[PDB]
């Protein structure tokens, strides 16, 4: 924090964040933005990357100023070709599954015979 105040300063505090995969390796941060960009103005916008060699990841992150911008994307942008295919939008943040689990198999079979 330099001596005095920049002004109106805000780090997505009250802002909703959007999933998109299954990006083309072509796209670019921006590509995302231009396909959200009629779903009302984007302010955070990227395309994940690899910290070890920085290609693109495959899934961007999308933010908006409001609400329904994003939920409206999320499901109309969702199962929409972006680029050159299709692309997976969804919720960025979501709560983990509960731990279970569960597996059955009915064999009733005692052995194989043939001649």
Do not use: C
């Amino acid at each position: 924090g330099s001596s005095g105040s920049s002004g109106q300063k805000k780090d997505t505090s009250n802002h909703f964040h959007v999933f998109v995969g299954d990006l083309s390796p072509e796209i670019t941060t921006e590509d995302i933005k231009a396909a959200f960009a009629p779903f009302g103005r984007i302010s955070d916008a990227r395309v994940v990357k690899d910290m070890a060699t920085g290609k693109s990841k495959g899934y961007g992150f999308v933010s908006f100023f409001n609400k329904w911008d994003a939920e409206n994307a999320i499901q109309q942008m969702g199962g929409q070709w972006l680029g050159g295919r299709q692309i997976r939008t969804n919720w960025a943040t979501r709560k983990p599954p509960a731990p279970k689990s569960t597996y059955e198999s009915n064999t009733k079979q005692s052995g194989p015979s043939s001649g």
